[PDB]
Design a protein around this motif. Sequence first.
Motif, PDB file in Angstrom:
ATOM      1  N   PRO A 162       0.807  -1.216   0.000  1.00  0.00           N
ATOM      2  CA  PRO A 162       0.000   0.000   0.000  1.00  0.00           C
ATOM      3  C   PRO A 162       0.837   1.261   0.000  1.00  0.00           C
ATOM      4  N   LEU A 163       0.256   2.333  -0.496  1.00  0.00           N
ATOM      5  CA  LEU A 163       0.900   3.606  -0.345  1.00  0.00           C
ATOM      6  C   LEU A 163       0.252   4.336   0.815  1.00  0.00           C
ATOM      7  N   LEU A 167       0.125   8.726   7.522  1.00  0.00           N
ATOM      8  CA  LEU A 167      -0.696   7.512   7.627  1.00  0.00           C
ATOM      9  C   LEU A 167      -2.152   7.875   7.897  1.00  0.00           C
ATOM     10  N   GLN A 168      -2.603   8.937   7.246  1.00  0.00           N
ATOM     11  CA  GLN A 168      -3.984   9.351   7.350  1.00  0.00           C
ATOM     12  C   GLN A 168      -4.827   8.649   6.320  1.00  0.00           C
ATOM     13  N   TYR A 173       4.592   6.956   0.723  1.00  0.00           N
ATOM     14  CA  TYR A 173       5.542   5.983   1.224  1.00  0.00           C
ATOM     15  C   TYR A 173       4.926   4.618   1.101  1.00  0.00           C
ATOM     16  N   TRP A 174       5.790   3.635   0.905  1.00  0.00           N
ATOM     17  CA  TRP A 174       5.394   2.249   0.982  1.00  0.00           C
ATOM     18  C   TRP A 174       5.328   1.849   2.435  1.00  0.00           C
ATOM     19  N   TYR A 183       5.675   0.913  12.571  1.00  0.00           N
ATOM     20  CA  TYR A 183       5.680   0.826  11.129  1.00  0.00           C
ATOM     21  C   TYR A 183       6.962   1.343  10.513  1.00  0.00           C
ATOM     22  N   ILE A 184       7.340   0.746   9.390  1.00  0.00           N
ATOM     23  CA  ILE A 184       8.461   1.236   8.608  1.00  0.00           C
ATOM     24  C   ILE A 184       7.928   1.674   7.268  1.00  0.00           C
TER      25      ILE A 184
END
Length: 181
Positions: free
Chosen positions: A17-18, A23-24, A55-56, A155-156
């Motif tokens: 996912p992008l 991360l909203q 970001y991935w 998360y990374i």
Amino acid sequence: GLIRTWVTLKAEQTILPLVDEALQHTTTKGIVFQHPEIVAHMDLMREDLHLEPFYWKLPEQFEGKKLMAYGGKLKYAIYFEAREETYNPQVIIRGGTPTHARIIVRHMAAPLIGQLTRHEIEMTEKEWKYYGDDPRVHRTVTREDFLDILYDIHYILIKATYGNFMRQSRISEISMEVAEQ
């Protein structure tokens, strides 16, 4: 032990996912597998293109009790195409017990257009920095903080958006060293 292992993606997990730094939101609408590279193309995400940069989000197997990673080497290969070629953090990690949850970033040289470029990022404090600090600050993360993040990774994220007006972006060869005994 000294039993060097690598976490990588499940052969089955062919899609990643992008997300925005925040991360909203999350996007899949423009992401496809094309072995080995995994490809996000912008033209299949036009609806979502304001939420950039992207970001991935690595999958859960990289998250969690990952104290053993502190040895080193987060590895991945990146390829992309954009109109022209030129701050934003190469990779981003958050983790910690609530009292010590914190976000750190790794800054690197922008990869070249059209040239698949490889990154290997040492999993230790000495080179990461703090989220929110301009990259020109000479402070880096304390070993202590770093380790508390690894103690439980939330998360990374790896940079998906590059250059100016980007067409497509590919990432492959994703792995991170751990340890067994």
